[PDB]
């Protein structure tokens, strides 16, 4: 067949797009942007994060990430942790919202993993885990 | 560990981003933009192609794609086949050949590094995931 159709980078990028599409539809409906949800997703377990780590987890440039975090701050979702390497945490409202979104994310993920269970892709998660490990 | 740690969409997005970042730097060097590279990639193996299909394969919204293709045209990399179908010019082709060669070299190093691992069949896994998602 053709180059693109079998190219690893294409297959990765298309997958991530198509797999994310439905959940991103949901975020959009909630009036939220994808980067905003990712910040929420990162902060749900952790108590506080440096904007620089938030950027790396969210796959964004530092400054774009901070424009976003500032907006969430203004809205009351997120706050700066006081100090004497700044860190950022969910507010209560932030934490409520993150929690209900992470719930949806998980259910949507389970829907998909189920659909994959019979197939070749059943262990997609370890596979990708392996990939990132190698890519390090 | 944490939620994001094991969350499939993160695992997909981060993989894709990390696998690409390697190659996406070379592209930057040859003085290209990611969507231009993608157009060259699509057109290396095909004679003509619709802008709709180009956009599809490149994960681009169609009008952004059409702007970009049209600028490539102005720069002499791509031309319309005399119904709108785009093909590479000789120059575009020399450039595609060159970048796709790099792509296939990077790809080989990656897949080679995966051959000892669970991830050895990654391409098949992904093409299955894609087939389910349709």
Automatic annotation (TrEMBL), chain A:
Name of this protein: Transcriptional regulator, MarR family
GO molecular function: DNA binding; DNA-binding transcription factor activity
SUPFAM superfamilies with a match to the protein in the record: Winged helix' DNA-binding domain (SSF46785)
Organism: Ruegeria pomeroyi (strain ATCC 700808 / DSM 15171 / DSS-3) (Silicibacter pomeroyi)
Chain ranges of the HTH marR-type domain: 5-133
Keyword annotations from UniProtKB, A to Z: DNA-binding, Transcription, Transcription regulation
Superkingdom: Bacteria
Family annotation (InterPro entries): HTH_MarR-typ (IPR000835), WH-like_DNA-bd_sf (IPR036388), WH_DNA-bd_sf (IPR036390)
